[PDB]
Design a protein around this ligand. Structure first.
Ligand SMILES: NC(=O)C1=CN([C@@H]2O[C@H](COP(=O)(O)OP(=O)(O)OC[C@H]3O[C@@H](n4cnc5c(N)ncnc54)[C@H](OP(=O)(O)O)[C@@H]3O)[C@@H](O)[C@H]2O)C=CC1
Ligand SMILES: NC(=O)C1=CN([C@@H]2O[C@H](COP(=O)(O)OP(=O)(O)OC[C@H]3O[C@@H](n4cnc5c(N)ncnc54)[C@H](OP(=O)(O)O)[C@@H]3O)[C@@H](O)[C@H]2O)C=CC1
Ligand SMILES: NC(=O)C1=CN([C@@H]2O[C@H](COP(=O)(O)OP(=O)(O)OC[C@H]3O[C@@H](n4cnc5c(N)ncnc54)[C@H](OP(=O)(O)O)[C@@H]3O)[C@@H](O)[C@H]2O)C=CC1
Ligand SMILES: NC(=O)C1=CN([C@@H]2O[C@H](COP(=O)(O)OP(=O)(O)OC[C@H]3O[C@@H](n4cnc5c(N)ncnc54)[C@H](OP(=O)(O)O)[C@@H]3O)[C@@H](O)[C@H]2O)C=CC1
Ligand SMILES: C[C@H](CCC(=O)NCCC[N+](C)(C)CCCS(=O)(=O)[O-])[C@H]1CC[C@H]2[C@@H]3[C@H](O)C[C@@H]4C[C@H](O)CC[C@]4(C)[C@H]3C[C@H](O)[C@]12C
Ligand SMILES: C[C@H](CCC(=O)NCCC[N+](C)(C)CCCS(=O)(=O)[O-])[C@H]1CC[C@H]2[C@@H]3[C@H](O)C[C@@H]4C[C@H](O)CC[C@]4(C)[C@H]3C[C@H](O)[C@]12C
Ligand SMILES: C[C@H](CCC(=O)NCCC[N+](C)(C)CCCS(=O)(=O)[O-])[C@H]1CC[C@H]2[C@@H]3[C@H](O)C[C@@H]4C[C@H](O)CC[C@]4(C)[C@H]3C[C@H](O)[C@]12C
Ligand SMILES: C[C@H](CCC(=O)NCCC[N+](C)(C)CCCS(=O)(=O)[O-])[C@H]1CC[C@H]2[C@@H]3[C@H](O)C[C@@H]4C[C@H](O)CC[C@]4(C)[C@H]3C[C@H](O)[C@]12C
Ligand SMILES: C[C@H](CCC(=O)NCCC[N+](C)(C)CCCS(=O)(=O)[O-])[C@H]1CC[C@H]2[C@@H]3[C@H](O)C[C@@H]4C[C@H](O)CC[C@]4(C)[C@H]3C[C@H](O)[C@]12C
Ligand SMILES: C[C@H](CCC(=O)NCCC[N+](C)(C)CCCS(=O)(=O)[O-])[C@H]1CC[C@H]2[C@@H]3[C@H](O)C[C@@H]4C[C@H](O)CC[C@]4(C)[C@H]3C[C@H](O)[C@]12C
Lengths: 262, 261, 263, 262
């Protein structure tokens, strides 16, 4: 059940938040927003040096505390240890923002089973491992899981087959456990974010020169993700066009799920 | 692009078809329908003894030829080598029916990463491996890939989280490469089948005392899958209720896809 | 612009309301609800005898005032004069509830053009005439027009062709003038009510078989209409099934209208 | 049931067709198309002068025959007698194209009950009278009724209240009788056409200085109406934008009607 409330930045004051993939792009922007809101933040990515810079800026911005732990989410042991360590750094966990992805570019699928497996491991499986590791703390705090996804996680696009598979998988998994938490009375919210083109360096390099579309600002995108998580909304849609978000909705699916539950 | 005509059993006559997970349930029924249609079939599953029975019955029903290769789709090497061997046995491949799943029951996700992993490997990754292995032959024959999926591969259900993840992944992956084949002029069709409750032994055991819904017959289900694949349809929907099929359709998704291209 | 508040029965206290087709069915129930709420009510229909009973009970229920004026809405002069009289009697008008229909039973269209014409005159044209007559008073009070319509005013059914024409016409006309009031800054709300099967005597005599049991209570129906009107809602949907109310919604239409609104 | 076939111009060859409001605009274009297809045509409108010109061009184009009968559809007696005359002229009737409207311009509704009644009489009631007169002949030929309507006959627009009421009425009436013909096994098709902005002189004059949108060609509009009628389609949608035609569809209504039919 989502909060029938207007979002206020104070909702994140003193909250203990993990942000993954936070060295750049949307993840970094989320860290910065949370810092401005006075959250405790633990950020992760592979890039130790840029993560320290992100942390330093978070402290400048007014984070209650800020730490980084560097590692690759290809490593499921790292994922497990990271959450345990992050929990100790903050003295608990209120929000788990899962945002990282493995390197993805626009290319036709040509026998690249390696990339399919890697995308599944980093983009999907690690999210599951992180969640399992975080759940005890999240149950303690009646916390929130925020899963960052994509238009390519709701509809099919050429050139992102492996990526799409992993993002669709996130939808299937996390939407299913959401239904389980509802019936099990587990007070942990799950927010799935569906993003259009966002003006991160990664996206801008990737779509040049294949796609020529309006890119939404990464700062606003980051805020909207946090907002949705804070308000415990089931899904967050963010795109430069309001008419895109109208097309992402799937009431037919909602009806089928409603009919099953009752 | 689907064939603008009604289905005839003669469409499968002499066609070279792989059916995975064909020792029982829908897979077995598909093998039987294909045999009745006079197709060449190679069936696979883990149990050689039960596959032997299927092959024997396939030849009785009038299969052009029938062979089994036994093994687990947990083994990606087996998946790759199976397709090559199946293709060798038949002298090519017209249709790849991907149907197998790892054993799944209705249970809460209780930090079962091992089941999530196994579901992703068997239900999804092996389908990709099998496809990669089969594609050269399918490109030669302008053939078809048929991916068996589920209502839980289109909408969310409690108690099947790992399974749902794997089936959602199939939609994402196979629907994406379908778009790729359309723009790359690859004349291999991809059919995704979305099934409601089907009266297989597995399903009836799994839902016993938990879900009380009417089950659709496995025989007709199997036929509808084959029909859709033969007709090169993008998606096949099979459920005991017609209203279910209406609610699984996603025109909004199709619009978004059309707008992209 | 609807009122962003919960309905209170006190919203109708001392309000001056006309209800047409109010001798029986939903109309009578509406008069009774308004009476209970302490409204001033003027009711109309052709039969003085039945209207007298409605007025008597309205007073008993606690109407601030209750009166009838009898006549046929086949007569556009009566329609016009009725509103003027009712308004003068009450000293204004806050709500105009348009509810009357000409007698309709379920039959195949059988070249009865006379019935098509009568349906259009009584069910549609008189509503327009009553509206024109009422508008000056409604503008003064920032009041409301409530137009009672039907499932057969949003979707097609056999056996009610003439009636459907008239109810569809109400939608086209009143939804258009609503758009006009929005841009002309006319502070009079228009509420179109879409009703499924309601257990009025007329409906129960008309319909056949088990469908009778799916009839919604006329008492609750009448209240929901008043609520919608009081809250200045654009549309009220009332049916015994929530799935029906889902299927009468037309967001596609709403989008086309929104896109035009600034064009 | 619509014809499971692609349209061929030969489908109208030798067919006996009435077109109302055919002195100009879409009606005139329809007459011209039918003429080219070698149909028998009877055209009507108030102006004999303009009708004569249409007839002359129809004969030029190769109509099997072409006649006009002038009169006002405000007059229900004329409406009825016109159909009898037209049927006598052609020796029967295969298609009745109901297209005429009373003069309508964009204006706020201001006590003009006279105009509301006139719109209802000409735009709606006359269509019913014409249908009643034509039905015996149409039953004999397993013929077709084509009712020309409007976006303002499916959605609400300001400035066309009286017109909208009349076009909505056509939908309510003719869609109801279509259901009646199905259950009564009357083999006469009813086609309701929903038109966006069409570049007729009337439309171009009316929208001048108030609406700025793409106008669809009247010739193609006319053809699509004829095609839909010939193929016994329930509805024809014609607009400059295909997205408009998507927004005019009402599947929910179709479901409600299907459920009642069951
Ligand atoms: N930008 C867009 O247009 C869209 C974005 N999205 C989504 O939003 C999210 C963020 O995208 P965006 O900000 O554009 O991506 P970026 O590439 O900017 O950021 C991805 C981050 O994840 C990290 N990462 C990469 N590999 C690994 C690894 N093996 N282990 C841990 N972290 C890794 C990166 O840091 P480092 O390299 O240091 O490890 C990087 O901080 C993604 O989930 C994506 O799916 C969805 C649709 C569109
Ligand atoms: N029945 C239903 O209600 C529904 C079915 N479906 C779908 O239809 C498909 C078939 O379902 P159903 O017939 O019920 O399933 P069954 O259990 O009847 O059959 C699954 C088959 O796959 C094989 N299999 C199991 N594990 C493995 C493995 N590691 N490697 C290779 N093969 C394995 C089995 O043979 P063996 O054990 O011998 O190996 C078995 O023949 C599934 O893809 C499923 O997702 C979807 C929704 C509902
Ligand atoms: N009940 C239902 O299932 C449904 C009802 N509706 C709608 O709700 C409204 C009320 O329906 P319901 O309560 O069933 O109708 P009723 O038959 O119960 O009441 C109709 C009223 O209008 C009056 N009336 C009939 N002819 C005339 C006339 N010529 N001039 C003035 N009044 C006339 C009647 O009184 P008198 O005869 O004395 O004039 C009667 O008071 C109708 O607008 C209808 O369209 C819509 C869908 C379903
Ligand atoms: N053009 C557009 O943008 C749109 C058109 N439409 C629809 O398509 C139809 C044709 O429109 P369009 O071609 O623009 O219209 P036009 O104005 O060009 O033609 C209307 C015709 O009807 C006739 N007519 C007018 N009054 C009467 C009467 N009292 N009796 C008999 N005929 C009369 C006219 O001839 P005369 O004056 O000599 O009698 C004229 O031939 C209309 O039904 C309309 O509702 C719908 C939406 C948009
Ligand atoms: C830009 C496209 C298409 C988005 C879309 O379909 N958007 C709505 C449709 C808009 N319309 C066509 C309707 C109108 C446009 C009006 S406009 O004015 O814009 O021309 C989307 C679809 C899939 C997206 C990629 C994947 O996620 C993987 C990856 C994640 C990284 O993190 C960033 C890089 C990358 C490659 C992503 C970039 C971009 O995000 C992609 C290409
Ligand atoms: C929910 C409420 C309003 C719905 C939309 C509207 O219905 C209009 C439109 C009709 C098309 O047909 C299908 C797509 C579209 C965009 C709907 C999709 C979806 O269902 C919406 C967003
Ligand atoms: C709103 C919320 C759920 C929506 C409906 C459902 O989505 C199912 C269905 C999908 C088709 O596409 C169009 C018709 C239909 C009936 C929708 C129409 C409409 O939009 C509804 C009523
Ligand atoms: C039966 C349910 C729900 C299906 C559903 O939601 N169906 C539409 C409902 C229709 N309505 C509610 C609208 C009306 C009912 C009319 S009725 O008369 O039936 O009451 C579906 C949803 C997910 C399904 C399982 C997974 O796939 C995984 C696995 C695959 C194996 O291979 C077979 C076993 C197993 C466990 C599956 C069994 C079954 O298949 C499940 C439980
Ligand atoms: C009863 C039918 C159909 C209503 C409908 O289509 N209802 C939803 C569909 C229900 N399903 C089929 C889906 C089954 C669900 C069962 S469930 O148990 O879920 O409810 C409706 C449609 C048109 C209606 C008449 C007109 O107005 C004219 C007139 C007005 C008077 O004032 C009262 C009398 C009369 C004759 C009206 C009576 C009744 O009102 C009619 C026949
Ligand atoms: C032009 C407008 C609006 C139509 C509309 O809403 N059309 C699509 C949607 C527009 N969008 C904003 C969504 C896209 C535009 C993109 S665009 O690139 O085009 O600017 C429509 C709606 C009602 C129409 C009148 C009535 O029928 C009565 C009458 C019939 C005669 O016979 C011809 C004259 C007249 C006055 C008609 C002219 C015109 O026909 C009107 C004004």
């Amino acid at each position: 059940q989502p909060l029938n409330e207007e979002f206020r930045p104070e909702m994140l004051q003193g909250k203990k938040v993990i942000v993954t993939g936070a060295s750049k792009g949307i993840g970094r922007e989320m860290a910065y927003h949370l810092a401005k809101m006075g959250a405790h933040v633990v950020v992760t990515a592979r890039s130790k040096e840029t993560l320290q810079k992100v942390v330093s800026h978070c402290l400048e911005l007014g984070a209650a505390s800020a730490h980084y732990i560097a590692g690759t989410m290809e490593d499921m042991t790292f994922a497990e240890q990271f959450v345990a360590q992050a929990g100790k750094l903050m003295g608990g966990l209120d929000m788990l923002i899962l945002n990282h992805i493995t390197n993805t570019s626009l290319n036709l699928f040509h026998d690249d089973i390696h990339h399919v497996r890697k995308s599944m491991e980093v983009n999907f499986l690690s999210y599951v491992v992180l969640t399992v590791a975080a759940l005890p703390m999240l149950k303690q705090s009646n916390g929130s899981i925020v899963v960052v996804s994509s238009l390519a996680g709701k509809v099919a696009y050429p050139m992102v087959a492996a990526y799409s598979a992993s993002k669709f998988a996130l939808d299937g998994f996390f939407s299913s456990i959401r239904k389980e938490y509802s019936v099990s009375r587990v007070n942990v919210s799950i927010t799935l974010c569906v993003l259009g083109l966002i003006d991160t360096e990664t996206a801008m390099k990737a779509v040049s020169g294949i796609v020529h579309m309006q890119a939404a600002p990464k700062e606003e995108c980051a805020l909207e993700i946090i907002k949705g998580g804070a308000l415990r909304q089931e899904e967050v849609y963010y795109d430069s066009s309001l008419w895109t978000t109208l097309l992402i909705r799937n009431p037919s699916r909602k009806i089928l799920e409603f009919l099953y539950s009752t």
